[PDB]
Design a protein around this nucleic acid. Structure first.
Lengths: 127, 111, 197, 106, 156, 183, 48
RNA sequence: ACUUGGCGGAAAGGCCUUGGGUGCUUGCUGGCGAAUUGCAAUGUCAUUUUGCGUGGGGAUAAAUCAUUUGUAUACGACUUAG
RNA sequence: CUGACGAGUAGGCAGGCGUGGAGGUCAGUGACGAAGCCUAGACCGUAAGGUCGGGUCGAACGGCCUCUAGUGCAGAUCUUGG
RNA sequence: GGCCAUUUUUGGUAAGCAGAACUGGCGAUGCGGGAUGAACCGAACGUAGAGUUAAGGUGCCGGAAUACACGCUCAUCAGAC
């Protein structure tokens, strides 16, 4: 379960790619404000790409929540995970990208007995 | 602007539907009588029909009773304006100016 | 509401038929306009002759081939007057113009089926009596459609092959009329007259 | 009996539009046999289904249905603004569609 | 720490709902539904069929029977909104309809008590139906829109 | 010892590479496409005919301003050409892969050339001398060929899964409503 | 105009049988066998 | 579904007609069954083609390259021959 | 809790994302495999960007509180290399 | 470094010319309409849903009446704002 939270509305789910992110390979797909005098993305014509702006902000009741309803939290070791014993169905653990496979089984065996949800239990499984 | 001479019915419908008040500015809906009472019991007015009565029977405390009301925020007319072009006079076939009693019709499409 | 709406083109106006036919193609109806060579245009003959000779001068300068194509057939004059309505450069326009079939005369899959008219397109229900009009066979012939007489010959065949049929129908309905006289005065005809039918 | 049809057949038309915009959320329906808005006041609220065939057979069948309802009338010639659950795919402009007789007013 | 632990943790205590002001209230059906009205069902397994309306239940549904000896539509709940109500009537007095309730139907061959109550109702119904001409044939038919049937013009 | 993307069985296959060969890259690609997918005996009897101007290699991608020819009617393409040096360096690799398939114990009647690719090599820079004292490059475009031959085999029959179904109660209530009627 | 039918002769020579083959030397020269077998009857198809 | 003959070329490929056979008949009066799909969620009822299996009929060739030709030609193409 | 308001180039100010390095801390992570690279796989943030899974790989590197700067790129007939 | 538009206006035959005056804009401004046009008409923009409208329009492209009503007009160069 989770908290009783309203229906999670995500006003603009599409990613705000840069203008000409596709046409050139040098122009990366990270957003930059167009600043040309002649520019048509700053000037917000019809049929051109939509800009990020504060109107697309998310609801403060359902902000930072995963689609399971828990705020994620990076967990390196067992001592970080036991800071979530009080808060099991509010936060969810997430094991970092540099934890060895001898410690992930320890962290999962602890989070199972503490009921803390891990958002990536399938990382580095020794099948 | 389009102005005219409102009857009792349109004033009553505006103050019951779109009538709000100014309380340290704070545009506040006039849902209860305690708002109008606590804000104009200095002036005799202690219910919403006391406001309507100071409107239509233009009285000694009309200025404060009018300035207590936030300006009305009307819709567009629910039947159209009745004309092809608004910006001629009501005498030439538009909308602006004095339209005396017919203002009631227009306000009952904007309320 | 029919699967195919066959339209007799005789005694209609080119633009006023083309408007309703173009709107019915864009709603999902299959329309075949038969006998397009007896279609009409308002104004006299010479007005429309000099409106076609002012269209016939408009080819490309540098290569006359790739310019505007000046079709001479009456079905193709009607088709040019139609496809300027349907937005034919899309795909919706192409799937609209593939619902249409416009012929000269009535080719023999379509002579056995009933042919409707469009009453807001007739020359007799629109034009004020006295205005001149233009049969499209004359206009197409004087700009170089070669086949008018040939189509006339086939029409001068098919009416005969229809008219005998009409007698072969009509006398039959005569017998049916006698049957509709012999069912009267019974109980069932009076009960049908009680319920309207 | 050769007929089982409990639906009025209608034709999908264009989206809600200006000359130059179009609003894909509200589709236009041309109901057969309806010519006036006073006649089209009957079909308000009645449920429309578009029915189309597909390639991959899911749920034991190849025929997939999109549902929706009539919302309001449109024009003086009996066009009907209707919304759907997922909007009609802008390729069905001229496709038949089924205005059912439920929710029944009568 | 690979992530700094925050300062405020929102508490897991759920709140109660507010005291809602929404009372239940019995349905008032439309003016064209009277017990004895011949209905035309519009959806389900028995679409197009014609059926005889009975006691209005208490779960916003209608109880209908065919009779089962005529068309094949048994005692069954049908919602009042998926139904066209025609103008014809049969007399409903003389049938002990008041046995049935919402408890009588429950999802958990066919139970024989339903067959017995079906026959008890249908004998009195057919004894009423035989008084008017052609109605026994009329209930055994189906409803279907023919060409040129405009249902905003059709008077049921 | 790494090759391209192969969807073949490495037990029944044989490979030959031949790197850094000073050939023309745009001609070796076309003779590598022309050989592709064929049986190895048809391949070796085709490449001995390209040298005699009996059959031509179809230039398809690297083919602009090539003179069209008659023998290209075998493959539908007007432009074709007879790259003798490229076909020599390809058929050397074909007899090398034939020998490497004979050393692995494979039957030389079912071999078809399955995976053959070429890709660019480090260019060999020389220099021209142009008007008004300039110098522009004059570079070789050598190739890295590689090919992998495979015994073909049949009986790859189309048995598949069961595709478990999610039919509802009101669907099986009509399906079982026909065994009481007909079936 | 539109050609609706054409009728050929009975036994064509070896100048028009050579016109219907690009390679006369490899060919089995089998042009008009099943057509010249239509004169085997009274010619009812050809009179048709 | 057989059969009988006639008509139809504008894109006939359809229309009319003869004699039987089988099936249904709501033209009229009957008997049984049709529930549980459980209060709607197309309740799956048009086809077209590709391919693969079975059965039954029919027939058993071309074209290209290479060689050649010169009434043809930048290359192809074209016309020829074996 | 209530109410109002939200175009913006040059420009001004604020809150922040990222980078190289420094003091502190998490007795942080790590050859049971750090950094890097690829990834029409996924999650979060309006966005700067952060995070995870998979492959590759081969020894170091991060979160936070502050400090410091040779700190952020599509364009300069920009430099070097390809 | 400005430009445009209405009313007033100087020079000039005249200008999409030069120079002034009041105001509005464009520069910085999107949007709906003028088929397209920086400044004309409307209306000035956080993200969405519903309703009603402005300017313009409702034969067909193009969403919306080939609506209603009284007249005029035939153009071998119509006219349509």
């Amino acid at each position: 379960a989770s908290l009783p939270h309203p229906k999670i509305v995500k006003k603009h789910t599409k990613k705000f790619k840069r203008h000409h992110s596709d046409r050139y390979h040098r122009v990366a797909e990270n957003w930059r404000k167009q600043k040309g005098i002649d520019s048509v993305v700053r000037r917000r014509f019809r049929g051109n790409i939509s800009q990020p702006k504060i109107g697309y902000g998310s609801n403060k009741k359902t902000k930072f929540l995963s689609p399971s309803g828990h705020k994620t939290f990076l967990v390196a070791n067992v001592k970080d995970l036991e800071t979530l014993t009080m808060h099991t169905k509010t936060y969810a653990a997430e094991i970092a990208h540099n934890i060895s496979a001898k410690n992930r089984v320890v962290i999962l065996a602890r989070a199972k007995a503490l009921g803390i949800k891990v958002t990536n239990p399938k990382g580095r499984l020794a099948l | 602007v389009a102005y005219g001479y409102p009857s009792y019915s349109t004033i009553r419908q505006l103050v019951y539907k779109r009538g709000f008040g100014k309380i340290n500015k704070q545009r506040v809906p006039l849902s209860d009588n305690a708002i109008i009472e606590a804000n104009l019991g200095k002036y005799g007015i202690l219910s919403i029909d006391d406001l309507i009565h100071e409107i239509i029977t233009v009285g000694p405390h009309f200025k404060q009773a009018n300035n207590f009301l936030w300006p009305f925020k009307l819709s567009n007319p629910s039947g159209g304006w009745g004309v092809p072009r608004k910006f001629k006079h009501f005498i030439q076939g538009g909308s602006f100016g004095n339209r005396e009693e017919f203002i009631n019709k227009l306000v009952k499409s904007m309320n | 509401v029919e699967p195919v709406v066959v339209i007799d083109g005789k005694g209609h106006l080119v633009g006023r038929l083309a408007s309703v036919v173009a709107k019915q193609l864009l709603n999902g109806q299959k329309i075949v306009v038969v006998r397009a060579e007896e279609l009409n245009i308002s104004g006299e003959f010479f007005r429309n002759k000099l409106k076609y000779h002012d269209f016939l001068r408009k080819a490309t300068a540098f290569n006359k081939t790739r310019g505007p194509f000046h079709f001479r057939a009456p079905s193709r004059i009607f088709y040019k007057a139609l496809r300027g309505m349907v937005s034919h450069k899309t795909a919706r326009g192409k799937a609209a113009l593939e619902r249409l079939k416009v012929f000269e005369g009535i080719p023999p899959p379509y002579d056995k089926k009933k042919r409707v008219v469009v009453p807001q397109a007739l020359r007799v229900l629109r034009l004020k009596p006295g205005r001149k009009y233009t049969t499209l066979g004359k206009l197409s012939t004087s700009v170089g459609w070669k086949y008018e007489d040939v189509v006339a010959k086939l029409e001068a065949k098919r009416k005969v092959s229809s008219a005998e049929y009409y007698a072969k129908k009509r006398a039959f309905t005569k017998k049916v009329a006698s049957a509709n006289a012999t069912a009267a005065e019974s109980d069932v005809a009076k009960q049908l007259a009680a319920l309207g039918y | 009996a050769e007929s089982h049809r409990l639906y009025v057949k209608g034709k999908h038309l264009s989206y809600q539009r200006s000359k130059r915009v179009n609003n894909p959320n509200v589709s236009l329906i041309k109901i057969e046999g309806v010519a006036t808005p006073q006649d089209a006041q009957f079909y308000l609220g009645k449920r429309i289904a578009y029915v189309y065939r597909a390639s991959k057979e899911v749920r034991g069948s190849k025929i997939r249905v999109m549902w929706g309802k009539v919302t309001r009338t449109h024009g003086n010639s009996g066009v009907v603004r209707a919304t759907f659950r997922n909007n009609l795919p802008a390729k069905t402009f001229g496709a038949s569609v089924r205005i059912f007789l439920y929710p029944s007013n009568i | 720490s690979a992530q700094k632990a925050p300062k405020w943790y929102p508490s897991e205590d759920v709140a109660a709902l507010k005291k809602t002001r929404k009372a239940a209230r019995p349905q008032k059906l439309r003016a064209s539904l009277v017990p004895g009205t011949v209905l035309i069902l519009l959806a389900g397994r028995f679409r197009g069929k014609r059926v005889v309306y009975l006691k209005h239940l208490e779960d916003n549904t209608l109880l209908i029977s065919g009779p089962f000896k005529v068309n094949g539509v048994p005692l069954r709940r049908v919602n009042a909104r998926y139904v066209i109500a025609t103008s014809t009537k049969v007399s409903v007095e003389g049938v002990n309809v008041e046995k049935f309730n919402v408890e009588y139907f429950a999802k958990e061959e066919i139970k024989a008590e339903r067959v017995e109550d079906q026959k008890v109702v249908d004998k009195a119904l057919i004894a009423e139906i035989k008084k008017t001409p052609l109605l026994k044939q009329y209930l055994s038919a189906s409803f279907s829109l023919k060409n040129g049937d405009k249902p905003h013009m059709l008077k049921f | 010892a790494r090759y391209g993307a192969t969807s073949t069985n490495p037990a029944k296959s044989a490979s030959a590479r031949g790197s850094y060969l000073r050939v023309s890259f745009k001609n070796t690609r076309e003779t590598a496409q022309a050989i592709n997918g064929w049986e190895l005996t048809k391949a070796q009897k085709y490449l001995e005919q390209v040298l005699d101007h009996q059959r031509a290699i179809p230039f398809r991608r690297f083919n602009s301003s090539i003179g069209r020819t008659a023998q290209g009617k075998e493959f539908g393409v007007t432009k074709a050409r007879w790259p003798a040096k490229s076909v020599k360096f390809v058929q050397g690799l074909l007899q090398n892969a034939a020998a490497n398939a004979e050393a692995k114990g494979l039957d030389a009647t079912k071999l078809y050339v399955s995976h053959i690719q070429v890709n660019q090599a480090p260019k060999q820079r020389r220099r021209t001398y142009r008007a008004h004292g300039r110098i522009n490059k004059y570079e070789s475009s050598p190739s890295h060929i590689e090919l992998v031959v495979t015994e073909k085999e049949e009986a790859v029959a189309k048995a598949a899964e069961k595709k478990v179904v999610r039919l509802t109660s009101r669907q099986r209530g009509r399906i079982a409503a026909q065994k009481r009627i007909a079936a | 105009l539109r050609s609706l039918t054409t009728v050929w002769a009975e036994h064509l020579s070896d100048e028009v049988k050579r016109r219907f083959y690009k390679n006369w030397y490899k060919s089995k020269k089998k042009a008009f066998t099943k057509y010249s077998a239509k004169y085997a009857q009274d010619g009812a198809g050809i009179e048709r």
